[PDB]
């Protein structure tokens, strides 16, 4: 609920110093502050004006303070990002930005659960964001080397990394046992021989980065906003759309071990693929809808093929990422029983594709 | 002219990586590109396509590169660049990386020292002037960034040596007139001087002032202000009485010191009325509908505000060019200028009688 009291107060000073009007002459003992998010990385704070103040002019009564905690060139990108996406009304304002962290809009919102991605009005929001995402030009490398790049970063780690407790090696043992560094150049062919435009990626598009935002429940459009760009680049756009697609079977909400739950059946029918690619397409082509209904339907059917292959990708990837994370990360969470889940979803939807 | 080959190549990778359309497979043999400015920091150069080569959408046919060279002092004004281009009041930016950022390449040419007096430019700097200071951006809004820079760079000019017999005997004199105490008397004018608190540039200068090509006939529209390496919120007397100390400096001439500082050239009453004249209704719209009693008061209170902050202008940038004499590799009358400015302080303090 309430900071410890040393960042209460470089809290206060952060306010007091970067945000105008009654910022500027407010009392550290009027001064509202609670967690919204611990860890040891990216904490988050409410910091707000008392309800008994007046604004002076248009500074706003609450933001966000963002602390960075345990992390150079990565600040610089995501900062410029942050900026730039602010600049164009595609993110919250940014109001302060100093070493240790920085100040954002407060946007009353709150997150999608997993079983919200299928609303068909949320799911062609999502869709629609996004291509409005991938239509961004950004002052970053256009070369798309993010995806390939990563998997063999993660998969030189994978196979170089030994376990103590019996478990965790049985579990390693059948993960390697599917020829990780053979199936990762099946995967370079087929994706090499599948068309797919190179624009600037989420990479991480999942129901803990969509804000429903509050009082807007009752729209049909323009109710919700993207964010947390950590893992953003330009990248296929196959990507992008396959990695949302898989993140409908995976819940990270269960509060007991593993603390996830995985269900292949949840993967979105082809109806349900049509009705998001159906939102997306007229928000990236300009007057995709005047075209005659058989390009509409090849041009869908194409993009149907590219992001359930570019979906393999997706669990490849995040599987690798996860038997990482189980040696190094200090979060509590089943890392090697989420790595085989996406392993399993990997050849499921390999044998679905006929590859 | 010609780039190293190492940069060549590094150019040629950069400008492929992170420009759209017909750069992005364009070969070695096909790159041009040419220095606009050498040294180990802040190097610029042109880059283009061949003259040949069709655009495919709407990507540069030439960008400039800047290479740093020599943390958070990189991320602000990364920040503050990016801004500024999505705002349409600094260059677009192209490709940002850890050694430096590809730009939009403006065709203008930099104003020579003479130009700043002409009275088209000077309104038109006033009017660019007053439009910086109206901008909201996400940086300490508390003005320490003055007496900060003062205080910081008296400590390194506290500490600083030399063993060649003609600088002991410059820094001897400069060192001769207390500067801590000096300081100090100026932070007691500044602070009994009454000035807005806004986003300054704080280097308003000839060299930082592009003449746009083809706009030459343009009255009111002809200027960009660039280069916000030391910009900060700040006195607004700073940014304007640093502007009128810059008609007394010229940093074109051939011959050392490689500045020419002339106390005579510093705006008269009328060419200072005329510049705060354009400056007063570009940063409040309601101006000019004041009387012509509260418009005349403003104005004269103004010309006593951005008089005093000018002798910040002096103190500042001569603590910064004694440092200079010590850390630069770059060639200059260092030691000369810090004693120009430091003149300049001394003689304008008399005038006003503080
Ligand atoms: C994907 O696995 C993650 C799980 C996290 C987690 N999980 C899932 C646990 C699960 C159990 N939660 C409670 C019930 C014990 C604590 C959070 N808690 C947190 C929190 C965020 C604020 C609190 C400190 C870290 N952060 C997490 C971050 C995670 O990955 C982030 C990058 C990977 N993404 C790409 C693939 C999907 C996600
Ligand atoms: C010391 O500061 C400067 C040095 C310059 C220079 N210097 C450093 C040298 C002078 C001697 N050099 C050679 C001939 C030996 C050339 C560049 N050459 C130029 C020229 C202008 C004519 C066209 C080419 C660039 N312009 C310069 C401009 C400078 O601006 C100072 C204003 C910035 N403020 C911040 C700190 C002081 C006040
Ligand atoms: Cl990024
Ligand atoms: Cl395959
Ligand atoms: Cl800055
Ligand atoms: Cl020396
Ligand atoms: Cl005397
Ligand atoms: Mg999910
Ligand atoms: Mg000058």
């Given at each position: ?14 306010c007091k110093e970067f945000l105008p009007g009654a ?22 704070f409410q910091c707000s004006l008392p309800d008994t ?303």
């Amino acid at each position: 609920e309430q900071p410890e009291p040393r960042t209460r107060r470089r809290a206060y000073l952060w306010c007091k110093e970067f945000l105008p009007g009654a910022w500027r002459g407010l009392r550290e003992d009027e001064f509202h502050i609670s967690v919204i998010r611990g860890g040891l990385s990216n904490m988050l704070f409410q910091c707000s004006l008392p309800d008994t103040t007046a604004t002076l002019g248009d500074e706003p009564r609450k933001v966000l303070l963002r602390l960075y905690g345990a992390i150079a060139e990565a600040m610089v990108l995501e900062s410029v990002m942050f900026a730039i996406l602010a600049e164009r009304s595609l993110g919250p304002k940014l109001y302060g930005i100093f070493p240790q962290g920085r100040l954002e809009q407060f946007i009353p919102s709150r997150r999608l659960d997993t079983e919200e991605l299928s609303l068909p009005d949320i799911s062609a929001e999502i869709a629609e964001k996004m291509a409005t995402f991938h239509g961004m030009k950004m002052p970053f490398n256009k070369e798309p080397k993010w995806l390939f790049g990563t998997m063999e970063k993660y998969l030189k780690e994978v196979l170089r990394i030994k376990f103590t407790e019996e478990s965790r090696i049985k579990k390693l043992h059948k993960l390697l046992s599917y020829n990780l560094p053979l199936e990762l150049e099946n995967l370079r062919s087929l994706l090499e021989s599948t068309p797919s435009p190179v624009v600037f990626c989420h990479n991480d598009c999942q129901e803990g980065n969509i804000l429903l935002l509050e009082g807007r429940e009752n729209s049909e459009k323009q109710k919700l906003m993207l964010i947390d760009f950590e893992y953003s680049s330009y990248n296929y756009r196959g990507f992008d759309i396959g990695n949302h697609f898989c993140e409908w079977m995976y819940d990270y909400s269960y509060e007991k071990y593993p603390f996830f739950r995985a269900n292949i059946r949840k993967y979105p029918t082809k109806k349900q693929q049509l009705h998001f690619i159906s939102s997306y397409l007229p928000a990236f082509q300009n007057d995709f809808e005047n075209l005659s209904t058989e390009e509409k339907s090849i041009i869908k059917e194409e993009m149907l093929l590219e992001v359930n292959r570019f979906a393999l990708a997706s669990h490849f990837l995040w599987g690798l990422w996860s038997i990482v994370q189980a040696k190094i990360s200090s979060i509590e969470f089943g890392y090697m029983d989420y790595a085989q889940a996406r392993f399993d979803a990997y050849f499921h939807q390999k044998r679905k594709l006929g590859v």
